[PDB]
Design a protein around this ligand. Structure first.
Ligand SMILES: Nc1ncnc2c1ncn2[C@@H]1O[C@H](CSCC[C@H](N)C(=O)O)[C@@H](O)[C@H]1O
Ligand SMILES: N[C@@H](Cc1c[nH]c2ccccc12)C(=O)O
Length: 316
């Protein structure tokens, strides 16, 4: 009966996704499922690897531009699509508080655990603001986001790059319909650059990205009673020149037979068979403008870091 419980209210979606992904001829698993407690902690670690420049690069821009962004938006409500990295969130909240504008915070995530942490953290640090955690998939459940106040919706970390172009276009269009006049969108997009720098960012020496990738198998093992042997799958990251995107795979070292008991499903991996677990699309600055335009959104500002590694867009 409680609004807070409705908003914070997945298991069905994982079942559907795992069945479809593992029974396809080209096997795949969606990257939205990487970020359980263990995966989120590993992502955290990823944000501090020397190879993985995106987080600190976008953080650098936000540290410099948050006050400008807040000034331009005039928003009183921060909506974050995909939570879990509060260092960036705090920068925008601080600026909104500085401006005497901050009334409300709405974190949005597919993982209920991540929402609780962010809600608790921001709740303790920002007195006198309304907090509504919204649990959902940003490809399906944007409607669950309350339509209140003037909302600055932020979608950082190049998470938009984890959508392929058709789903990405549908996401932007649905996002645009959810925004009301006066609302603003802040979008982070990692940029095309040296291909070796790109591959290494998803294939670090410390082996952390590999553990992060293999952890999706642990999620499925736990949630659906499967028996993936994690060490039997090799992490592989590749650049796709045609699509200008990183592609992340798990490759079976030897033939594998996997029983997914909760789905009453048995699946086979040939030796050398690869399963797609993520893409990370890299953008050209002029194209972000075009993709936003297609969705009916008008980019009003573009910022980049001092090295030009990463892009941040403000639109209405
Ligand atoms: N399809 C989806 N719907 C809702 N949340 C998603 C999602 N796919 C990934 N996420 C969430 O988004 C986060 C991505 S990693 C952290 C992103 C953070 N905003 C940053 O910039 O660093 C995770 O918490 C993950 O659970
Ligand atoms: N949004 C992040 C997510 C990510 C970082 N490292 C990964 C490794 C595998 C899959 C996804 C990721 C990115 O594409 O940069």
């Amino acid at each position: 009966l409680s609004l807070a419980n409705y908003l914070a209210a997945a298991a069905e979606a994982l079942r559907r996704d795992v069945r479809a992904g593992l029974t396809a001829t080209q096997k795949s698993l969606p990257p939205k499922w990487f970020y359980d407690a263990v995966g989120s902690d590993l992502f955290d670690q990823i944000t501090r690897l020397p190879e993985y420049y995106p987080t600190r690069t976008e953080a650098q821009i936000l540290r410099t531009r948050s006050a400008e962004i807040i000034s331009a938006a005039g928003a009183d409500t921060l909506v974050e699509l995909g939570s879990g990295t509060s260092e960036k969130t705090r920068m925008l909240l601080d600026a909104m508080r500085d401006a005497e504008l901050l009334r409300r915070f709405i974190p949005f995530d597919v993982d209920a655990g991540v929402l609780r942490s962010a809600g608790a953290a921001i709740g303790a640090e920002y007195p006198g603001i309304e907090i509504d955690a919204v649990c959902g998939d940003f490809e399906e459940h944007l409607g669950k986001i309350p339509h209140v106040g003037r909302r600055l919706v932020v979608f950082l970390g190049s998470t938009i790059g984890n959508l392929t172009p058709a789903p990405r276009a549908e996401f932007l269009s649905t996002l645009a319909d959810t925004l009301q006049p006066g609302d603003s969108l802040l979008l982070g997009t990692d940029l095309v650059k040296d291909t070796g720098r790109l591959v290494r960012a998803y294939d670090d020496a410390a082996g952390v990205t590999a553990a992060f990738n293999r952890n999706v198998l642990a999620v499925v093992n736990r949630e659906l009673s499967a028996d993936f042997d994690l060490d039997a799958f090799e992490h592989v990251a590749k650049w796709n020149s045609d699509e200008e995107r990183i592609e992340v795979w798990l490759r079976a070292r030897t033939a594998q037979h996997v029983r997914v008991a909760a789905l009453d499903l048995e699946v086979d991996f040939a030796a050398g068979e690869e399963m797609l677990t993520a893409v990370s699309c890299k953008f050209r600055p002029e194209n972000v403008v075009a993709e936003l335009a297609e969705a009916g959104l008008r980019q009003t500002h573009w910022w980049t870091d001092p090295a030009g590694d990463f892009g941040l867009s403000l639109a209405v």
